[PDB]
């Protein structure tokens, strides 16, 4: 009973067509700014990306390793940790996961920022799981 928990990132965007898109719907699972950054409470966790953005454009989107050393997904690659939490808002002393998209790839805009907190340790673990709509 319990042990498996997931954190997920939903991003939808809507289209000068090749400009800052107006429809931003960055979404963080189970996240309440007021409550504060979500903190994993389980031994195992998996990371996934969501194309809420409609596949109607040459535009493309990605999250690039930046301030944080550990890139998304690589995180799932059996990376150990002591404690971790995530919040859309910059968390002081936090890794920065730029959330960005490019029309086609020729042009780019700094649409989103995700920030994370690192706590060194061994209990928490990088983990892989598959894909389903839920």
């Amino acid at each position, epitope marked *: 009973y319990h042990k498996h928990t997931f954190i997920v990132l939903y991003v939808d965007f809507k289209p000068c067509f090749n400009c800052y898109p107006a429809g931003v719907n960055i979404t963080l699972a189970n996240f309440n700014e007021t409550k504060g950054p979500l*903190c994993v*409470d389980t031994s195992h966790f998996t990371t996934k990306y969501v194309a809420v953005y409609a596949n109607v454009g040459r535009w493309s989107a990605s999250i690039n390793t930046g301030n944080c050393p550990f890139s998304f997904g690589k995180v799932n690659n059996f990376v150990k940790f*002591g404690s971790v939490c995530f919040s859309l808002k910059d968390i002081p002393g936090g890794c920065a996961m730029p959330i960005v998209a490019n029309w086609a790839y020729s042009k780019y805009y700094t649409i989103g920022s995700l920030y994370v*907190s690192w*706590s060194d340790g061994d209990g928490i673990t990088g983990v892989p799981q598959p894909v389903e709509g839920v």
Partner: antibody, heavy 122, light 108 residues
Framework: VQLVESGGGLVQPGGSLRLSCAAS????????IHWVRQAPGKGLEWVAS????????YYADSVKGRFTISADTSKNTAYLQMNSLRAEDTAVYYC????????????????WGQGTLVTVSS | DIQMTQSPSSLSASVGDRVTITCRAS??????VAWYQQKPGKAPKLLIY???SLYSGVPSRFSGSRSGTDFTLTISSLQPEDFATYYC?????????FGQGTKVEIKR
């Protein structure tokens, strides 16, 4: 590098008052700052914390509207405003700091002020 | 949606003996665990963070450990100066809560 609670005393029920947290040694903007109450001969419970730089206000389920937190950077000092005080509120009030070696995550409360007493009675 | 239960409520023991205090994580968590010491009518004092992190000025005998949800604080040898109330805290720069706490007494 020390902290001092100030403005502790008595106020009558329904009164409102503000508390002073003096700091020495560090710029308050760089660290989280919390306030904790100690019920007389009872356990402590978390009240709220504030990060000056990003103006993050985080309160406890106990007192969303009842109290509010602030701090002035030029003052280099933290404030705590309270209203419509109730009998349960009567407690000792300590302000204190937070630090992490990792930085982003897991941390602790290192330094405390002496703490002041607040009473609500006629 | 997270808290902790601190056991025991209170205890006494002989001097230099081993003392264990635990907190069971109401809904288990990560490494946000911390233990503090408060002397009577005195300012609370920092002891341990994430079980394994001791601030400078902490004597060696104190130890903190994790066993899943149960978080243990162990003082190897009871010292008289140690007499006080001790509380366990789970949280980060945001949130946090406290357990009933355990005052420790010296049997002499």
């Amino acid at each position: 590098v020390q902290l001092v609670e100030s403005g502790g005393g008595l106020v009558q029920p329904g009164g409102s008052l503000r508390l002073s947290c003096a700091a020495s040694g560090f710029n308050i903007s760089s660290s989280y700052i919390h306030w904790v109450r100690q019920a007389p001969g009872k356990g402590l419970e978390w009240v709220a914390s504030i990060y000056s730089s990003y103006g993050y206000t985080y309160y406890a389920d106990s007192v969303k509207g009842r109290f509010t937190i602030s701090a002035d950077t030029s003052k280099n000092t933290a404030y705590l405003q309270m209203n419509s005080l109730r009998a349960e509120d009567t407690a000792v009030y300590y302000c204190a700091r937070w630090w992490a070696s990792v930085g982003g995550a897991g941390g602790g409360l290192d330094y405390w002020g002496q703490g002041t007493l607040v009473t609500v009675s006629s | 949606d997270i808290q902790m239960t601190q056991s025991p409520s209170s205890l006494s023991a002989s001097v230099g003996d081993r003392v264990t205090i635990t907190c069971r994580a109401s809904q288990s968590v990560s490494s946000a665990v911390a233990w503090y010491q408060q002397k009577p009518g005195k300012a609370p004092k920092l002891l341990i963070y994430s079980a394994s992190s001791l601030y400078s000025g902490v004597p060696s005998r104190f130890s903190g450990s994790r066993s899943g949800t149960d978080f243990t604080l162990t003082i190897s040898s009871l010292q008289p100066e140690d007499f006080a109330t001790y509380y366990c805290q789970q949280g980060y720069g945001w949130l946090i809560t406290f357990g009933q706490g355990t005052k420790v007494e010296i049997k002499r």
